[PDB]
Ligand SMILES: O=c1ccn([C@H]2C[C@H](O)[C@@H](COP(=O)(O)NP(=O)(O)OP(=O)(O)O)O2)c(=O)[nH]1
Ligand SMILES: O=c1ccn([C@H]2C[C@H](O)[C@@H](COP(=O)(O)NP(=O)(O)OP(=O)(O)O)O2)c(=O)[nH]1
């Protein structure tokens with residue numbers, strides 16, 4: 001669909017792979033060990049710099065297994081990697097558990113998902129068109145069946 | 146439009162609905178009652194298995210009302226449901242509040258949003274093209290100026 | 291490109307800007323001060339109402355800097371702003387730190403990213419096609 005130029009900047013850097021054929025995302029591998037204390041955050045280096053084809057972004061998303069089993073997630077999920085970013089890809093992991101969480105070298109601790117981007121042009125208006133939803137949000141449709 | 150084949154695998158399973166005509170997401174209904182303690186996570190079963198038309202993924206997203214009013218969210222938001230996944234759709238709910246949170250059968254506790262997928266091919270390079278953002282990230286553009 | 295009609299409903303409201311030329315998102319500016327206590331949430335008003343071109347949604351996403359440095363994030367990230375919503379854009383910020391976090395007027399405390407929407411029609415089936423992933427999820431591919 002699209003091309004990503006990848007520059008490795010760490011000996012342990014891995015080109016990400018789609019772990020199944022129909023996978024949305026490719027898993028991101030830590031290049032260094034990081035210990036994340038209870039109720040804190042750590043910054044995990046992926047040791048890669050990217051140039052996405054124009055018109056695409058990369059989302060950095062939480063992996064479901066680590067969330068369920070260790071209460072670890074990507075704190076800024078979905079992390080926005082901009083088309084024009086040329087720095088190192090890094091992942092902000094939060095440990096919401098009561099236990100230490102250790103990231104080892106090669107551990108897949110997030111997934112990257114490419115999405116097409118769409119630029120907005122804003123037009124100032126005195127009034128908007130009316131809809132049925134209108135100003136309803138934040139639970140306006142209820143919870144209970 | 147696109148089509149989703151849905152198989153109900155639990156007696157309390159419900160076909161998800163778009164709650165307003167221009168809603169992005171369709172709401173996902175719990176099939177079991179689950180109590181989620183303060184500062185913990187619970188697994189909510191939706192009792193459905195999906196086959197999305199090829200080319201599409203499902204995102205499992207937090208509902209704003211429950212986040213604001215109960216500090217309940219989908220811990221892996223946006224949860225990645227792969228085109229090729231044929232298992233049961235499940236939601237990891239975190240309770241970040243100090244109060245017990247009870248999910249009742251039929252409760253709409255997350256939403257599914259269909260998105261088109263875009264597969265990357267990686268080309269490894271020695272150097273990338275330069276941009277004005279460059280390696281600036283993690284707050285490089287400031288907060289108040 | 292696509293068009294968003296924007297109505298300001300607060301004197302401090304700003305038209306959001308893409309902060310770099312290749313930025314996915316436009317930053318959302320608070321119009322009122324909000325104090326968010328440790329392990330709490332606050333609702334931040336952006337003072338704008340939108341009408342997106344049909345076929346598009348707005349995602350309200352966490353900014354990486356504030357998450358890393360202050361453990362502040364958008365609690366419902368990515369927040370779903372529906373095509374048919376005509377109310378004020380608001381941001382649910384959670385403070386997961388042990389320190390007070392103050393939002394000042396003008397502070398860019400989230401970003402908006404436009405995405406195209408795709409409406410599903412459900413067809414109920416007794417059986418689904420088989421795949422290689424099959425029922426594997428929640429760690430089925432490993433961590434190492
Ligand atoms: O970050 C957000 C998310 C939602 N909203 C508004 C606009 C959106 O169209 C509306 C509903 O969003 P959700 O469907 O994500 N939340 P929920 O299902 O609780 O509310 P509702 O019952 O109104 O659909 O709330 C915001 O202003 N900010
Ligand atoms: O998960 C992430 C998110 C961001 N980043 C990098 C790439 C992105 O282009 C850059 C800025 O992302 P955000 O705009 O989401 N963060 P923030 O607005 O704080 O930073 P900046 O001021 O540089 O835009 O940070 C990562 O490496 N990982």
Ligand SMILES: O=c1ccn([C@H]2C[C@H](O)[C@@H](COP(=O)(O)NP(=O)(O)OP(=O)(O)O)O2)c(=O)[nH]1
Nearest residue numbers: 064065205224225227230235427428429430431
């Ligand atoms: O919110 C979610 C996310 C995932 N899933 C299922 C479907 C998805 O295809 C599968 C794997 O999702 P992730 O890739 O996000 N999780 P992880 O990488 O831990 O599992 P796996 O190793 O199977 O890919 O889990 C859910 O049911 N709900």
Ligand SMILES: [Mg+2]
Nearest residue numbers: 019063111431
């Ligand atoms: Mg996975």
Ligand SMILES: [Mg+2]
Nearest residue numbers: 141164208256
């Ligand atoms: Mg809703």
Ligand SMILES: [Mg+2]
Nearest residue numbers: 286309353401
């Ligand atoms: Mg930014």
